[PDB]
Amino acid sequence: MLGFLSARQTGLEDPLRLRRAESTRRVLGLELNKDRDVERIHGGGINTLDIEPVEGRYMLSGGSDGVIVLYDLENSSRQSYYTCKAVCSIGRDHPDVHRYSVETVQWYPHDTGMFTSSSFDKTLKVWDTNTLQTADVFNFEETVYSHHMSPVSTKHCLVAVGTRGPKVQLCDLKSGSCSHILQGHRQEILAVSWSPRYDYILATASADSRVKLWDVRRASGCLITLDQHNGKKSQAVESANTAHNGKVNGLCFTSDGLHLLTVGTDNRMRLWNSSNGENTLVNYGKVCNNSKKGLKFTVSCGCSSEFVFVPYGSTIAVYTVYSGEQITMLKGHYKTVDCCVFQSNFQELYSGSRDCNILAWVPSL
Amino acid sequence: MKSDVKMSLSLPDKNEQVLFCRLTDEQHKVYQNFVDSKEVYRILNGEMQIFSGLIALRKICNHPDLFSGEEDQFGYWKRSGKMIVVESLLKIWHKQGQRVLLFSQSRQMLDILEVFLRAQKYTYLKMDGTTTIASRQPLITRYNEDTSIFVFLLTTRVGGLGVNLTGANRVVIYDPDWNPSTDTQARERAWRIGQKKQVTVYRLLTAGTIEEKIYHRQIFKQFLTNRVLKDPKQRRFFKSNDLYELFTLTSPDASQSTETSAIFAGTPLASSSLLAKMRARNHL
């Protein structure tokens, strides 16, 4: 590493080299945090986490008990040991608390003054973070499994919602229009994710073992349907062209948005060319998941090699996205891990699981 | 609309009136017998289709001879008040030298109006659904080119959309329809681009009858379309029960004003604009 510092000082290597190499080294040295703790307030398992995209300071967490906790991740104390204190809380005494489990919570991109939370109580609530009051509510005829706002859209502000209905809802936060729907799936839509690269590209994964990419501006259904075999087993499109041999319960675009990682209940993760949905045949081995709802997993950013952190039983499996090589198992949870969210500023990880714990993984040394 | 683009093209002024034509006493008796007969009672019980009762009352307000079935032949114009007003308007307009469009949704009452015009000495021309399509264009042309034809007979829904009837000056809609658009098209057909003289539309209604409620429904649908398409904020005109109950007869005695006039008695985002718009829409 002194070689890295010397090369940076002498201009031999771009500082990009040191930055991404050290980010990768930090991610590889991920371990149970020696001096850090997260305050425990959820009475039930944490189903979702979200660190705000700008300044990466505050973290939302939705629990199976319906409460939403807002934590400050910064060590505002002077000690090396600190607990991520809870700033705010939609608790059981809040007038607008979710009646059932909160399954997805997401900070509004471009601004930390608002966030959103969808629950199995058939509601997508939009909260003002300052007053901590519901600015809006969208009701659905069937329970919400996931939702996502575009991390890129300066123009549109649509929330793509996947419920147990076979339709992907698009709720306009600009003047409230939840009527827009996308047809083409056949069972519950367990995951939805906007492309970080393209403004109007949305990937939706449903229990019909299919993943569809939509240009929501378009009037002609999905753009691409992901196919495991890319055409080896080709059939007229009524039941073929499946992404997995089970329910596809998780989506994640890579950092650049040029590839898509789909995890399904066939104990398989697959990497897809996001421009034509071709399977890249990256192996990843066996990725154990049996979740009946959406599975939240994230990818690394700002590193020499991209990593993907997938909940794997009661562990976090870290894989290399483009080679599939298994990095490691982060092993500190006592029950199945529901979500993991990656802090890209310091290569940190926060994992929420059914054991009512949010565990922080920090690079060692 | 023709509000922003009006300055580019010309448009002669258009005036419109809704005449409220009292029922004749025989017509009034027939209407009251029908609204007291057991058929409308079964309609109110839901045991029979209300639609036949609607058609029957519309027939009664058009002319009793439709529903019931010298100076006593078929379709005598003295037995329906709307035909009295058509008598007066046709006579006055012929003395004025104008040219008339005579509209009616019913082709049977269109034929009754033809027989009435033959009983008078008005020259006229008829075009309806029974005329062959290949000979529709000549008739219109013959009406539009000369003045020796006085009144042209239509139903609101015959011909292609907007058949060019320009030589007409006055237009009378003999009976209202359920669709606002067919009556709007009826009045629009005379008053189009390249209309030389001021065109006025007279809608003929029978007050306190089914026809008044048909006109009320027509205005209500027009209001709904306008609210959806041009501006949501709109002064509310109607009552839910009065608008929907349409099997009664309260003919005015001129002591109290008509129902229509009683109803119309007065005449990237920076997450704060986004939040402001959300809370604004939600407080409403």
UniProtKB/Swiss-Prot annotation, chain A:
Provide the protein's localization: Nucleus; Chromosome; Nucleus matrix
Biological processes per GO annotation: DNA damage response; double-strand break repair via classical nonhomologous end joining; positive regulation of DNA repair; proteasome-mediated ubiquitin-dependent protein catabolic process; protein autoubiquitination; protein polyubiquitination; regulation of transcription-coupled nucleotide-excision repair; response to auditory stimulus
Q: Which Gene Ontology cellular component terms are annotated? A: Cul4-RING E3 ubiquitin ligase complex; Cul4A-RING E3 ubiquitin ligase complex; nuclear matrix; nucleoplasm; nucleotide-excision repair complex; nucleus; perikaryon; protein-containing complex
Per UniProt, the keywords (alphabetical) are: Chromosome, Cockayne syndrome, Deafness, Disease variant, DNA damage, DNA repair, Dwarfism, Nucleus, Phosphoprotein, Repeat, Ubl conjugation pathway, WD repeat
The cross-references to InterPro entries, in alphabetical order and at most eight, read:
G-protein_beta_WD-40_rep, Rad28/ERCC8/Ckn1/ATCSA-1, WD40/YVTN_repeat-like_dom_sf, WD40_repeat_CS, WD40_repeat_dom_sf, WD40_rpt
In which pathway is this protein known to take part? Protein modification; protein ubiquitination
> Pfam families recorded for this chain?
WD40 (PF00400)
Domain of life assignment: Eukaryota
Coiled coil stretches, renumbered = none
Residue intervals passing through the bilayer: none
Q: Where are the WD repeats?
A: 33-73, 88-129, 133-173, 177-216, 235-274, 281-321, 325-363
Q: State the Gene Ontology terms under molecular function.
A: ubiquitin-like ligase-substrate adaptor activity
Q: How does it assemble?
A: Part of the CSA complex (also named DCX(ERCC8) complex), a DCX E3 ubiquitin-protein ligase complex containing ERCC8, RBX1, DDB1 and CUL4A; the CSA complex interacts with RNA polymerase II; upon UV irradiation it interacts with the COP9 signalosome and preferentially with the hyperphosphorylated form of RNA polymerase II. Interacts with ERCC6/CSB (via CIM motif); promoting recruitment to lesion-stalled RNA polymerase II (Pol II). Interacts with KIAA1530/UVSSA. Interacts with a subunit of RNA polymerase II TFIIH.
Associated pathology: Cockayne syndrome A: A rare disorder characterized by cutaneous sensitivity to sunlight, abnormal and slow growth, cachectic dwarfism, progeroid appearance, progressive pigmentary retinopathy and sensorineural deafness. There is delayed neural development and severe progressive neurologic degeneration resulting in intellectual disability.
Q: What does this protein do?
A: Substrate-recognition component of the CSA complex, a DCX (DDB1-CUL4-X-box) E3 ubiquitin-protein ligase complex, involved in transcription-coupled nucleotide excision repair (TC-NER), a process during which RNA polymerase II-blocking lesions are rapidly removed from the transcribed strand of active genes. Following recruitment to lesion-stalled RNA polymerase II (Pol II), the CSA complex mediates ubiquitination of Pol II subunit POLR2A/RPB1 at 'Lys-1268', a critical TC-NER checkpoint, governing RNA Pol II stability and initiating DNA damage excision by TFIIH recruitment.
Would you tell me the protein name for this molecule?
DNA excision repair protein ERCC-8
Swiss-Prot record, chain B:
Tell me where in or outside the cell this protein is found.
Answer: Nucleus; Chromosome
Which residues does the UniProt record annotate as the domain Helicase C-terminal? 85-244
**At which positions is motif CSA-interacting motif (CIM)?**
271-283
Q: Where are the transmembrane segments?
A: none
Q: How is it modified after translation?
A: Phosphorylation at these two sites promotes the intramolecular interaction of the N-terminal domain with the helicase ATP-binding domain, thereby probably releasing the inhibitory effect of the N-terminal domain on its ATPase activity. Phosphorylation is essential for its chromatin remodeling activity.
Q: Where is the signal peptide?
A: none
Which disease does the UniProt record connect it to?
Cockayne syndrome B: A rare disorder characterized by cutaneous sensitivity to sunlight, abnormal and slow growth, cachectic dwarfism, progeroid appearance, progressive pigmentary retinopathy and sensorineural deafness. There is delayed neural development and severe progressive neurologic degeneration resulting in intellectual disability. Cerebro-oculo-facio-skeletal syndrome 1: A disorder of prenatal onset characterized by microcephaly, congenital cataracts, facial dysmorphism, neurogenic arthrogryposis, growth failure and severe psychomotor retardation. COFS is considered to be part of the nucleotide-excision repair disorders spectrum that include also xeroderma pigmentosum, trichothiodystrophy and Cockayne syndrome.
Which family is annotated?
A: Belongs to the SNF2/RAD54 helicase family.
**What quaternary structure, including any partners, is listed in this protein's UniProt entry?**
Homodimer. Binds DNA. Interacts with ERCC8. Interacts with RNA polymerase II; interaction is enhanced by UV irradiation. Component of the B-WICH complex, at least composed of SMARCA5/SNF2H, BAZ1B/WSTF, SF3B1, DEK, MYO1C, ERCC6, MYBBP1A and DDX21. Interacts with KIAA1530/UVSSA. Interacts with ELOA and CUL5; the interaction is induced by DNA damaging agents or by inhibitors of RNA polymerase II elongation. Interacts (via WHD region) with RIF1. Interacts with SMARCC2/BAF170, SMARCB1/BAF47 and the neuron-specific chromatin remodeling complex (nBAF complex).
What this chain does, per the entry, is described as: Essential factor involved in transcription-coupled nucleotide excision repair (TC-NER), a process during which RNA polymerase II-blocking lesions are rapidly removed from the transcribed strand of active genes. Plays a central role in the initiation of the TC-NER process: specifically recognizes and binds RNA polymerase II stalled at a lesion, and mediates recruitment of ERCC8/CSA, initiating DNA damage excision by TFIIH recruitment.
* Entry comment, domain topic: The CSA-interacting motif (CIM) mediates interaction and recruitment of ERCC8/CSA.
Q: What is this protein called?
A: DNA excision repair protein ERCC-6
Q: Write down the species.
A: Homo sapiens
Lineage per the UniProt record: Eukaryota, Metazoa, Chordata, Craniata, Vertebrata
Q: Its gene?
A: ERCC6
